[model samples]
Target: SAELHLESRGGSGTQLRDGAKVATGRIICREAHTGFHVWMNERQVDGRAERYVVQSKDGRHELRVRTGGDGWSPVKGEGGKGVSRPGQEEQVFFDVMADGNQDIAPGEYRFSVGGACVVPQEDNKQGFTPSGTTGTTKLTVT
Candidate 1:
């Protein structure tokens, strides 16, 4: 079994522009020859709603944006070439446009990395094991 950890590359108060690199981190794998996939989860706080709330300009009803599983598209490394060695680390990141092509509303958001390890099975198949979410970081967008 392997583990994953997400780390913030900048300070919590750091501000960024739309479509820019909102968060940057690394995925550390504890076991060798393991392949992993990762995705982003956004919220105001940990364990809160995974959807984005877009406030109405006139203070009317709020627009809730939930891309569902599509929002956090699993990013998988290149096939066999993507395997990691023992205690190896790989870089991971998220941009403002992570939720498809739409730009996220400007505001404060907490981001975390969720992923799992893929172990190669017999006959060139693959098996997945959950690594859960790790390392919550804050980011401000304008």
Candidate 2:
């Protein structure tokens, strides 16, 4: 079931959770000169977190990523596997785990922890399906 919490910032702190970890999908209008940034547990999760190549839209874009799992490293005893990561849509960002490319350190993690905007080829901007755009859920972590 989805979980909604009350935050001091006024807006309800709503989230979809599977258990322990939570997902944070950020939506922002892509800037002409820069990308956006996201935060998780006060940490940056996106690799190259400060600069994400925009491969979606010009005006409004959503970074559908995942995070806040056990950890994806071997040293911390994750067994070189990604912690329980949330499910994701493949049309936009890539998965560090499914492809056997997870390089994250184990412990609590955040997806799109920080977002960065970058210019991308025009063709790469199409598949990003927006939430409530076509009755399909816009995003979720797990």
Q: Which candidate is the best by lDDT?
A: 1
lDDT of each: 0.36, 0.23
**Model 2 regions lying over 4 Å from their true place:** 1-22, 43-142
Model 1 bad stretches (over 4 Å) = 1-15, 30-35, 43-106, 119-129, 140-142
Model 1 lDDT per residue over 5-110, tens place: 5444543223323323434444544444433444344322222222343332333322232321223332332321122222233433322223223443455555
* Per-model tally of clashing residue pairs: 0, 13
- Ten residues in a row with the worst lDDT in model 1? 78-87
TM-score of 1: 0.39
Q: What is candidate 2's CA lDDT for residue 57?
A: 23
Q: Write the per-residue lDDT of candidate 2 for residues 1-142, one digit (tens) a residue.
A: 1111211221112331222112323323333322221222222234323212221122232232333232211111111211211222111221211111222122222222222222233463544321111011112212
